[model samples]
Target chain A: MNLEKINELTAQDMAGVNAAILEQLNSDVQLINQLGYYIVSGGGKRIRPMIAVLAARAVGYEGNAHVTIAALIEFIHTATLLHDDVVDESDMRRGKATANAAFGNAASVLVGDFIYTRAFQMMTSLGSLKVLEVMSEAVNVIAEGEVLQLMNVNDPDITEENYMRVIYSKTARLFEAAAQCSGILAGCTPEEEKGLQDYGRYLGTAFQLIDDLLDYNADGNVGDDLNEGKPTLPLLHAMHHGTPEQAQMIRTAIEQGNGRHLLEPVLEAMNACGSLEWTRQRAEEEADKAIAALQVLPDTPWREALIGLAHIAVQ
Target chain B: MNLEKINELTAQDMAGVNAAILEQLNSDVQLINQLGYYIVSGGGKRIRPMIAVLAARAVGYEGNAHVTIAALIEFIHTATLLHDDVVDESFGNAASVLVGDFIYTRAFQMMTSLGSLKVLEVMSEAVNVIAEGEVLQLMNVNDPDITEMRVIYSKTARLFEAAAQCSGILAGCTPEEEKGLQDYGRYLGTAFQLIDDLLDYNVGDDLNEGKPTLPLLHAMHHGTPEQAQMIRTAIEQGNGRHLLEPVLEAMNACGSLEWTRQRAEEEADKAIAALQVLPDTPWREALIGLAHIAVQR
Candidate 1:
């Protein structure tokens, strides 16, 4: 499977999906229309939709419905982003002001809702009860994930298992749904469906691990997560390695959501234990698992592209 | 028709609709679950759902799908109430602190989406194009009605039209299917709706109304034809008659929700005229119109 060829095909599909997304996000409500267009078109990687398109093609689905599903997944994800910014009360995202910050919480929330309802309307058009059930259940789980994340916001005792659950619920469920729906659309066998589900789960976990690592190392700074005292991998490792008094200080900082003074010492502790490398290695392992799960798919351009996305994310 | 008997039937049907509403609004999101329960259980008249049930019953709908329609309408209406309170930044509703103020904007908005989506789901069960069409039409005419007739038309028109259309759709009608069912729904719905409106206009508009406006007689007496231009102005003016202007002033004095006040007056006026041709029973005519004007703005 030539990964480059798969990338080319995936990128081509994304061009069409992006156009549909722009068209659907257009609305008569001025703020909703403007803000929706701004955030969706704000140049985040179209990874989830890309996965759907690729997975569908891998299974030989030629129908355009896969493209519709791809767009629907993106809409659902975008709606969640708007709502999450409000919940997190953060001021910035993806090198731009958060929607909640730009338009106020009221408009962000309402427009988020407009997108959510519109996604449902689109899904209903697919005329598949299975699709509706999967989407609805995924939304409910995402809501639960949000509540769980809220609970973990400042709790230093948040464990790796809890973090993985959060990643699966919030980030991976939609990915899994997209991949599984592709298999369903293409009339894949149950064994093949399970393989896609595993692929999505592994890819999703790897994606979040990269995000966790990026919070520390990306752009030459441990970013907002550190300043806000979030116990990401680096800070968590630092807590484990620090002296008793230093650990107490770190714990207090996490609880207080301010750790500006502890940043350098925390980084030193993380570096000493190679925690950043450990996190990156974990992401790499997940990537390998994702590719391994794709073994069931036949030799196809899309099959190779799915494997390539795993490598591209980690690299 | 005996208005008392009609009221009893509506009340009975609404009780069932209310239970379905309670069930649908339940969720695991803590704040949403609590607030959804609080709002639904807060106990307004449940008039919107009542209209759905009565309209269905008036058409002699022997089946229970009308109950689903009623529940769907109530959920949609309730969802709007939650969002409306947030939009208006309201503090006081039904002598209690508005939950919208506490739950913050996100929860309310999300819950509203949930309800709206669920309504769509239920409508799909019946696949009623009428419900969606009626709602779209109502959305188009949110502005004030300028004439007494147009005011009544705006208020009762959608309800009557939707009731008839829904009946036709539910019964699986053709272009010419069941004209009788359609007419029965429209006539009964128009009569029942307008009477409800008259009651609110004649009575002090409830706490929901948030301001007082002139009744037809009051508008006629103190309002110049120029001043009384339409139900919109009657409410928009806050006082179609100068006498009610003080009440409007008073309501606005503390905190003004002009839209809510205007809606109350408009509903009242439209309710009054909806049943003029129904029959000669004063009480029945009054009840019919009064119900229409009761809960709506």
Candidate 2:
């Protein structure tokens, strides 16, 4: 299937999904409504929600529950963003003022709660305890991951294994749930559900790996991930590749949280070792494996789009 | 009932309730756990939870659910305190050191979610709806009452209404659910709640009230009911009461919030002037009448 054609076909479904999100985000608290509208309407490719929609369609879900579920996924993601910005003390996101910066921490927090409660209310509307359990566990694990990330922050010795677990817990776990829930929503078999779960996990790891690589090599200046002293793969790879002095220098910056001024030289070192390309290649392989996991599903536009999403970040 | 004796008898129940709270508040986040422990252990009377426990016992609720329900009430109340401290920018709570002042906001929001979700999980937990309804209505009426008298009137009205509603819901009574439950809970809850509010006004409103109410009343002694009412009313009402009431002798050493001092004084006034003044003798008769009028009217 032509990936562009599939995305185009899914546009109507996405519009419905977006509408549900906007309606859910609406609140009497003016700041909640305004900031929620800003974040939801802020253009980030609706990748996660899109995956849910496609997964449902792939399994022939004809009802609107999938659309609601897709929106629910997006709401949870956005609520996390609100909390993450405060925890990370981030000022910039998607080339706009982060909600914490624009709306104050209190507003960000209270609105985050508004979204969280709203998401629960929407999930309960589905009247599925199984879905509620999945969603609740997903949120609980995300909180655990957040605390774990805090522990790793500014710690130069953070190992790749530890880093991988953090990203999986923080980001990919939700992706896995989104995919798994889609399968559950579509009445897929236990084996089929496991397959979709693996597909999401592998694909999400790939997505996060690209994010790490892009922090060093992206054309845009938005990748403050490294500057913020986060121990992404490119930096980890650079430590693996560099001399003792270079590695020590990187370590000091990470420890000091003083990498902002060192971003250029760090990028230069990463380029010298081709760490960006190396990291991107790993992401690409993971994406390939994600697509391969879907081999059991018959050829369909939805399955093809899922593969296409795995490449969206790569291209 | 001997109040102190009753409290002593329930000491173990309170301890069990507190232990359950500590368990529920645990999180992987060190700060979450630390702050949760500090605040949950902080010395509040646990009055709301006590009400839940006592109400359950009074109704002969022999199930273990009441224990969980009581703990849930305290959790919800504690969660509100966390959020309230943040909203009011209060730094006085003992937990401030461990959780940091700002963390209270996050803690409150998180705990509120936990309490709300747990209430939903317990199926029989009914206070969730009642508390939500009361809070939502309270939010709407903030600053609406302009005079002390009016504020007290409106507040006492809502207090009685809420208490009765809370009791009714907790007991799960049929048809007369609104009237019966609300009447019993609202009267007792209102009397207790209003006394607490009046005590704040009498003792000088804390940072939470944003003013020294007694001083303001002192300065406004000869002040018209309108002026005294506005000062007292605003303090009772919300956020910026401190800015409005600056002096001690303005209302005259009216002992601060003691617009009318003495619990017995206030209770006497309430008894004589109660909206639902049902004809009844002392003790149980009075309480029943208070409950009926608290909701029925």
Candidate 3:
């Protein structure tokens, strides 16, 4: 799917989503209105919301519930972003000061919760037990993933399995739910629903993998995963394959979570072991699997757009 | 209406609530299970869960779902407590936020077992508002302009109100009946928190934490301008652990603790009065009993 056309393809739906988001974001508290509206509008590209909308259209759903789901999907995403920033103590997001930086962690946490519960309120209005079950658990899984990632921090004993588990739980789970809910609403069969869910899961994994890859390669500096003491796939692979001295260097970096000191050694080891290439390769595979999962759908621009997203994932 | 008899009346139902809470607090993550279980098992009064059960029984609910609601009510209460501490004296900090989240979401997930959109609607909105109230309380800290009565209403009483309100809805109570139970919970909750605020001044916790409460407000109102400035300094500085003695003298001079009790008694009275809409039953009497007990030592 061409990014430009995919943007245009969902133009009407995106307008509806924007309107609904603005309405729901209305708050008596001045802070909630200001901060909630600011970050949400800036935290754009809204790929998750678009996925919910596109998955509905691809599956041939005729109703407009997807639009509401689209809005809700954005709420969940934004809420988590606000909370995640607090958890990470991150100051910059999308090249802007994080809400926690601008508004303080307390306001961010509370407003994030406000949006979260507001999203919860929205989903209940949809009146589907299945929808509640999926989205509610989706959020919890994300929380669990967050905690798991925290647990793994400053530990060199972390494995690829553990790292990927964190990725799937924290990132992929919501993507999977976004697509599965849309498919369910489209009245798809059990197999088709599973297929859409798998599509989302794989796509989400690729998205996160590429995101982590960008952290290191984007500026050729130590990335966030390193700076934050998080052990991503590239770092883990480099540690696993590098020589004992290199591995020990990486291990100390992981233990202390001070990557700036060990940037040269860490990048050198990753380059020597082809770890970055390996990560991209893994992301490409996930993107391919995401494409394969949607083979059941008939030829349509929506499906093509979905395919385009995966190809873009690899690109 | 006796306190001991109140426990007896809801014994069977409450046992289910306790057991379900233990089961729900389970998690593969060691910290989550440990902290979730620790706080849930901590010697809380179980007042909110009791209100849920009593509300369900008072409205003649025969199903087992109220057990789930009762457990969820307690779970939510425990979550707030976990996060409320931020630096939990009993354990560690930071995990307080995450485990608080675990219990909260698990509570939401359990509501799905009820399969009633109305239950989900009521409970989800309740959790949101409760969170908002919590944030309000945090923002109000050291803020003398925030009335003790209003903080108690938002932070403490809203959950109580929501617990009773949702139980009524689950038990198929009419809208008016739901409102009555809601008022019942609200008044009792405020009274409960008022007593808590009262005890804080009499006890040393509030002084140590420098929490501004109703009695402190009364003391400020009745004290001289120098005394008021001292009190505000003691509170905002949060190092008033030593200053609590002089603070106590000023509060006692104003009969501030007594004044707070008087206000709580009025609220407890209104709580009992709200229950007049219900036909007299053992469960209803127990609710009224707790309302009376709310202001007691």
Winning candidate number (TM-score): 3
> Which of 2 and 3 is the better model by DockQ?
3
lDDT of residue A282 for candidate 2: 80
Residues A89-166, candidate 2: write the lDDT tens digits.
678888788887776655565566567656666766666556666666666666655555554355677777887777
lDDT of 3 at A287: 94
In Å, residue B174's CA in model 2 sits off its true spot by: 5.5
lDDT of each: 0.58, 0.59, 0.81
Off by over 4 Å in 1: A1-5, A151-155, A218-222, A231-234, A257-261, B1-30, B48-297
Q: Give the TM-score of each candidate.
A: 0.68, 0.74, 0.91
Tens-place lDDT digits, model 1, residues B1-297: 344455564666656766666565454445546655665577555544555565445434566666666655544444434433322121222111122212322322222333334333433322222222222222323332223333333334444444444543553444333343334334444444444444553354421332222234244334444433443344444434434444343334433343334554454444444433333443334345434444343
Q: What is the per-residue lDDT of model 3 for residues B1-297, given as tens digits with 9 covering 90 to 100?
A: 777889898999988887888788766667766764665476766789899989988988888788898888877777777666552112433466566666777888888778889888888887787777766655555253424365677678988998898889898997777988999999999899888988876557777766777888788789878778887776777546777778888988879989989999999999889888887898898999999888884
Candidate 1, residue A145: the lDDT equals 50
lDDT of 3 by residue, A41-84 (tens): 89588888888999999988888999999899999899888877
Ten-residue stretch with the least lDDT total in model 2 chain A: A144-153
DockQ class, candidate 2: incorrect
- Model 1 - which docking category? incorrect
Better of 1 and 3 by TM-score: 3
When sorted by lDDT, best at the front, the candidate numbers are: 3, 2, 1
